[PDB]
Amino acid sequence: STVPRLHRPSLQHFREQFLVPGRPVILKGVADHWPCMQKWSLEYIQEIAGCRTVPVEVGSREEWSQTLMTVNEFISKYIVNEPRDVGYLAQHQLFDQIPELKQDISIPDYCSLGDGEEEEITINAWFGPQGTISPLHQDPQQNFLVQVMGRKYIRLYSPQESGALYPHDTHLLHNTSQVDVENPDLEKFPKFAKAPFLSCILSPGEILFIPVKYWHYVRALDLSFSVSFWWS
Template identity: 70%
Template structure:
């Protein structure tokens, strides 16, 4: 473990004077004093227990700030304070011959900083978690092989796909030119399935995404998960668990538990660069107004039966199917009144109707709204035009990646 600390300490500035702690007046002087004390302890012979105590105080104070009011009103300075608290805690945990359990705790602390904090010191928490994750993967190589053998034998149910009438099917086109896509689909805002445009992704070719692969590159990482079959259900909730726990509890479990694992925005790919390297932003996104930094990448991973209720999004969307199949239904925004959006501001972009079993007495106009539908297969990319209503149901274990762009 001395080698582990050597790798970790190699990420730090060589002395206290070069360790940056610059904050504006939003952060109280008492908190800044705590941060400076932690920095001083780091470069002295202070016992880890005292370093841990000080780090936890910083985390407790900043956590209270992060959870006061709505997230968009949280000062970035306090998110940076939280990240520093996570950094000091990880360093205290790893300084004195950490056990495998303590290393797992350190990884979770890094992930919390990456999820809730803001980047500090050239994103040092990301560099730290990569070192710690490599240590875990070395220590559990035999266990991973056992899991690989077990999951290889898992039979994932493959129910028959819904019958799609040709007159209602989303059209398919193979590798259109940029100009053809722009003229025929982007400008008129027409849905289309693009075939052959992601066949080169490592996620589909070099090392196809599977339960075994996800365990190996992300199993011990803590991620945000939405629990419940759909976000409009009363029992729907959010939690933070490891990818391994999610797989064991909701993917491989034989219980009749259904959960939607939605790793919001691009957090999964920011946390786990190995997965981000397995995908590429579709070339067609260059037809938008912004650059790659303005494209939001979302990960969708969950068992069969999970549902995204009929809803609309304020941006263009490429939905790329990597694993499994999904049934999708699309409605043009011109038929919004027939789709009965929720009256509340929070869910105004979501329909009240159960798409595949509508209550015709409550929502009589819904059955009159025309729609297109499809079954998205691995390698397919569905273009969902801005504000087009879409309903999604996973037919089996599924992993999709969506790209939101303007």
């Protein structure tokens, strides 16, 4: 079934029906008027950030590596010029690096329902072409994933389903599923087929609440820019 969409729910409604129980929801009417929604084109990003160095993941989390290049180089090589490989400006605190871009976003008011300090909220950029794919994984904090450019297909599995997701057994990867969500090996991972899940296509202006430790899988359907807020 699908992730519910709610227009600007009250803090109490979000707290009681989603945050405390740990249920995903898409928040509408919250980020849809942030300046990033109209301002962030490739041209604007090049103007404000083009000369800055960013980490770039090449390949798939299959070979995989991490390199460094300017935002201009990343756009030229992995977005516009028939890219030879998938490259992803992933999980980077771009707004600490470039404060002028921080003016174009806000911290969702709902974060103030957490027990942590606003100063400790981690804001990550996720800027990449169509076709970037995460592994199915879980994170140790709450998350508001804000979609700015393009759309993402997202699949969500409750932590109650962890047994059917076959986490890696190394300590380093125990938060990551061994399963390819969209083409699972059911001969090796048979419990995966009957694990229930939620899914959605997250579109610009929408915020997906990913509860702490909820398993999530993310595939970009277009040229995409998302901003995640990791909070507690």
